[PDB]
Design a protein around this ligand. Structure first.
Ligand SMILES: CN(C)C(=O)c1ccc(Nc2cc3c(cn2)cc(-c2cnn(C)c2)n3C(=O)OC(C)(C)C)c(Cl)c1
Length: 248
């Protein structure tokens, strides 16, 4: 029905998502829209508690560094609950890609720069996500914004994570997300048996297909991102200077 976060009252309009936490589309006293995430802490161990405090801390610090990280306006933390007041975005990248059959080569490129800016910011603060998927990015006024940092599907899993993990592990993952926006399928979507899928990702003999596309610069980015040897894989600062990201 309604909720209070640091003196301010908010009215629920819809529930966006939901284990111990629930996300809502809310309204303040000035009828301004936000997204409040309520976390129930009643049955949470110290390890869980610290992980939650660590993502809020990072979310707080990184606000000041990039507009490609979701706005955290305010928050209320007690022993029983967490209330996080954030900006409301239109739709997450995953749901957006499920609905949208095709993708505009310009909208894709714009969303790509956004993902690199967001993931580059977290790298600059010693964070490696490791579990990057489209469900982690949000569309906020024609801009992709990173929703979480991995502190609190297997098609996006880097080969090095399975062989046993660095900022290059997030490169593989982003590379898979762009491969999806380019080819409508992730590189190992064709394999259903999850065990066999994990083998294909780490097997260098399993030569990933890259069909001929009109955007030669885009095909190159995907080849550079999806190199099984992390030492051979392209970095984010290099990706940021690629002709695909920088040229019209
Ligand atoms: C399929 N879905 C549920 C949608 O079409 C959809 C997706 C996203 C939407 N907006 C939205 C979702 C949001 C936020 C802000 N706006 C903030 C968050 C959030 C939670 N934790 N952290 C660190 C950020 N958030 C969120 O978690 O969204 C999902 C439930 C979709 C994953 C809205 Cl209003 C609808």
């Amino acid at each position: 029905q309604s909720m209070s976060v640091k003196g301010r009252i908010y009215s629920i309009l819809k529930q966006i998502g939901s284990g111990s936490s629930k996300v809502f589309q809310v309204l303040n006293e000035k009828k301004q829209i936000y997204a409040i995430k309520y976390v129930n802490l009643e049955e949470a161990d110290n390890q869980t508690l610290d992980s939650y405090r660590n993502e809020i801390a990072y979310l707080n610090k990184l606000q000041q560094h990039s507009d490609k990280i979701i706005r955290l306006y305010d928050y209320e933390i007690t022993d029983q609950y967490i209330y996080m007041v954030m900006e409301c975005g239109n739709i997450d990248l995953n749901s957006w890609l499920k609905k949208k059959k095709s993708i505009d080569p310009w909208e894709r490129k714009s969303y790509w720069k956004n993902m690199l800016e967001a993931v580059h910011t977290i790298h600059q603060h010693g964070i490696v996500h490791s579990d990057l998927k489209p469900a982690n990015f949000l569309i906020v006024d024609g801009m992709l914004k990173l929703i979480d940092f991995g502190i609190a599907t297997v098609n996006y899993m880097p080969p090095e994570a399975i062989k046993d993990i660095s900022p290059k592990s997030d490169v593989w993952s982003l590379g898979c997300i762009l491969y999806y926006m380019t080819y409508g399928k992730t590189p190992f979507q064709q394999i259903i048996n999850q065990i066999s899928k994990l083998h294909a990702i780490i097997d260098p003999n399993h030569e990933i297909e890259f069909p001929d596309i009109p955007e030669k610069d885009l095909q190159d980015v995907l080849k550079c991102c999806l190199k099984r040897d992390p030492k051979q894989r392209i970095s984010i600062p290099e990706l940021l200077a690629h002709p695909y990201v920088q040229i019209q």
